[PDB]
Design an enzyme around this catalytic site. Structure first.
Site, PDB file in Angstrom:
ATOM      1  N   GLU A   1      -7.845  20.807  17.565  1.00 26.31           N
ATOM      2  CA  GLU A   1      -8.444  22.117  17.796  1.00 26.31           C
ATOM      3  C   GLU A   1      -7.563  23.074  18.604  1.00 26.31           C
ATOM      4  O   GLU A   1      -7.340  24.228  18.255  1.00 26.31           O
ATOM      5  CB  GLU A   1      -9.832  22.012  18.499  1.00 26.31           C
ATOM      6  CG  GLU A   1     -10.971  21.470  17.658  1.00 26.31           C
ATOM      7  CD  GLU A   1     -11.381  22.264  16.421  1.00 26.31           C
ATOM      8  OE1 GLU A   1     -11.094  23.440  16.317  1.00 26.31           O
ATOM      9  OE2 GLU A   1     -12.029  21.679  15.561  1.00 26.31           O
TER      10      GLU A   1
ATOM     11  N   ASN B   1     -11.910  34.634  14.282  1.00 27.20           N
ATOM     12  CA  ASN B   1     -12.286  34.431  12.895  1.00 27.20           C
ATOM     13  C   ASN B   1     -12.594  35.765  12.180  1.00 27.20           C
ATOM     14  O   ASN B   1     -12.815  36.833  12.790  1.00 27.20           O
ATOM     15  CB  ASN B   1     -13.448  33.446  12.780  1.00 27.20           C
ATOM     16  CG  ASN B   1     -13.149  32.065  13.354  1.00 27.20           C
ATOM     17  OD1 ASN B   1     -12.216  31.343  13.000  1.00 27.20           O
ATOM     18  ND2 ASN B   1     -13.951  31.651  14.313  1.00 27.20           N
TER      19      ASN B   1
ATOM     20  N   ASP C   1     -15.231  36.352  10.497  1.00 29.84           N
ATOM     21  CA  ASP C   1     -16.588  36.567  10.990  1.00 29.84           C
ATOM     22  C   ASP C   1     -16.701  37.650  12.042  1.00 29.84           C
ATOM     23  O   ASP C   1     -17.781  38.206  12.220  1.00 29.84           O
ATOM     24  CB  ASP C   1     -17.079  35.320  11.724  1.00 29.84           C
ATOM     25  CG  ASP C   1     -16.865  33.990  11.049  1.00 29.84           C
ATOM     26  OD1 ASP C   1     -16.558  33.930   9.850  1.00 29.84           O
ATOM     27  OD2 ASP C   1     -17.006  32.998  11.752  1.00 29.84           O
TER      28      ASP C   1
ATOM     29  N   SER D   1     -16.250  36.622  14.958  1.00 32.83           N
ATOM     30  CA  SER D   1     -16.459  35.650  16.023  1.00 32.83           C
ATOM     31  C   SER D   1     -15.085  35.167  16.464  1.00 32.83           C
ATOM     32  O   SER D   1     -14.105  35.427  15.767  1.00 32.83           O
ATOM     33  CB  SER D   1     -17.267  34.447  15.520  1.00 32.83           C
ATOM     34  OG  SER D   1     -16.575  33.792  14.474  1.00 32.83           O
TER      35      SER D   1
ATOM     36  N   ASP E   1     -13.209  31.552  18.447  1.00 36.19           N
ATOM     37  CA  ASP E   1     -13.305  30.220  19.029  1.00 36.19           C
ATOM     38  C   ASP E   1     -12.526  30.139  20.345  1.00 36.19           C
ATOM     39  O   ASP E   1     -11.379  30.587  20.381  1.00 36.19           O
ATOM     40  CB  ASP E   1     -12.720  29.208  18.064  1.00 36.19           C
ATOM     41  CG  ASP E   1     -13.437  29.195  16.716  1.00 36.19           C
ATOM     42  OD1 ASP E   1     -14.661  29.294  16.718  1.00 36.19           O
ATOM     43  OD2 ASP E   1     -12.784  29.086  15.686  1.00 36.19           O
TER      44      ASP E   1
ATOM     45  N   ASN F   1     -17.376  28.282  19.333  1.00 40.65           N
ATOM     46  CA  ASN F   1     -17.516  29.577  18.686  1.00 40.65           C
ATOM     47  C   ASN F   1     -18.428  30.599  19.363  1.00 40.65           C
ATOM     48  O   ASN F   1     -19.558  30.277  19.779  1.00 40.65           O
ATOM     49  CB  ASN F   1     -18.006  29.266  17.301  1.00 40.65           C
ATOM     50  CG  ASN F   1     -17.953  30.474  16.422  1.00 40.65           C
ATOM     51  OD1 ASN F   1     -16.940  30.945  15.927  1.00 40.65           O
ATOM     52  ND2 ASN F   1     -19.142  30.978  16.232  1.00 40.65           N
TER      53      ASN F   1
ATOM     54  N   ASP G   1     -26.400  18.766  18.120  1.00 41.04           N
ATOM     55  CA  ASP G   1     -27.058  19.826  17.358  1.00 41.04           C
ATOM     56  C   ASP G   1     -27.232  19.466  15.917  1.00 41.04           C
ATOM     57  O   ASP G   1     -27.705  20.271  15.100  1.00 41.04           O
ATOM     58  CB  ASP G   1     -26.278  21.117  17.424  1.00 41.04           C
ATOM     59  CG  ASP G   1     -27.178  22.331  17.234  1.00 41.04           C
ATOM     60  OD1 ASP G   1     -28.315  22.392  17.841  1.00 41.04           O
ATOM     61  OD2 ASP G   1     -26.802  23.294  16.464  1.00 41.04           O
TER      62      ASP G   1
END
EC number: 3.2.1.17
Length: 129
Positions: free
Chosen positions: A35, A46, A48, A50, A52, A59, A101
């Site tokens: 990562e 991203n 998006d 968004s 990270d 995120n 989750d």
């Protein structure tokens, strides 16, 4: 901060990640390697809109607030800047939410591409633990 592999592995074990939700420490070290390459400052924007953040690339659409992500929630209840610090506590505490989750470690795409089903016990090698 860029951690050393066993330095991070010790840090993670100290924060309760070894076999947490049945996932070996080596799983966690492998995911952080692919990562962020062990760098606490790593960010990826991203498409998006968004981003990270941090050593486990959490995120901003769901987990932390960066104030620039449309329709973000803040499930870990932290600013995303806190995930960029040299101490891993905030990142680990949030990752403990993310792994429970419902997709286990599949939430980290680099873990499922590079670590899933491999001999992950190799990432803990030579670590006095």
């Amino acid at each position: 901060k860029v951690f050393g592999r066993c330095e991070l592995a010790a840090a993670m074990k100290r924060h309760g990640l070894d076999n947490y939700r049945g996932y070996s420490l080596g799983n966690w070290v492998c995911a952080a390697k692919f990562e962020s390459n062990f760098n606490t400052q790593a960010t990826n924007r991203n498409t998006d809109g968004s981003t990270d953040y941090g050593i486990l690339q959490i995120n901003s659409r769901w987990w932390c607030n960066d104030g620039r992500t449309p329709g973000s929630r803040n499930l870990c209840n932290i600013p995303c800047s806190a995930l960029l610090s040299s101490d891993i506590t905030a990142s680990v505490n949030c990752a403990k939410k993310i792994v429970s989750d419902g997709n286990g470690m599949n939430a980290w795409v680099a873990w499922r591409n590079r670590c899933k089903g491999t001999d992950v016990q190799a990432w803990i090698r030579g670590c006095r633990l």
